[PDB]
DNA sequence: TTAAATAGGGAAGATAAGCAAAGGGTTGACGAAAGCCCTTTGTCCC
């Protein structure tokens, strides 16, 4: 129920991130992940 | 071209009825990340 979608994501050039600069300009491709900000109700983006 | 001295107490402010219907509220322009092909320029090999 969850794994197949994980192979779906890793098949393409997907990335998991919490902070990015693409929200200021669409042409940006900067993605970084922060481990210290992970909590119970922390929303992430991909 | 005046010195002082005060300016009311009481009562009381109406009720009933009703405020409409119909029609319409616009279009056109503001994408990134690739795949393939061709051409040109430049480098290297044969």
Helix locations, chain A, DSSP H: 3-11
Way it was determined: cryo-EM
Nucleotide nearest to A13 in CA–C1' terms: B33
The values of phi and psi at residue A24, to 5°, are: -95, -40
The structure was resolved to a resolution in Å of 3.2
Per-residue burial over A3-41, b = 16 or more CB atoms within 10 Å of its CB, e = otherwise: eeeeeeeeeeeeeeeeeeeeeeeeeeeeeeeeeeeeeee
Q: CA A40, C1' B1: Å apart?
A: 96
Q: CA A21, C1' B22: Å apart?
A: 56
> Coil, strand, or helix at residue A29?
coil
Q: CA A10, C1' B44: Å apart?
A: 38
Q: Is A42 exposed, middle or buried (0-12, 13-18, 19+ CB in 10 A)?
A: exposed
């Amino acid at each position: 129920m969850i794994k197949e979608m994980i192979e779906d994501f890793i098949s393409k050039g997907g990335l998991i991130f919490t902070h990015s600069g693409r929200y200021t300009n669409t042409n940006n491709s900067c993605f970084i992940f922060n481990k210290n900000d992970i909590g119970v109700d922390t929303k992430v983006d991909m």
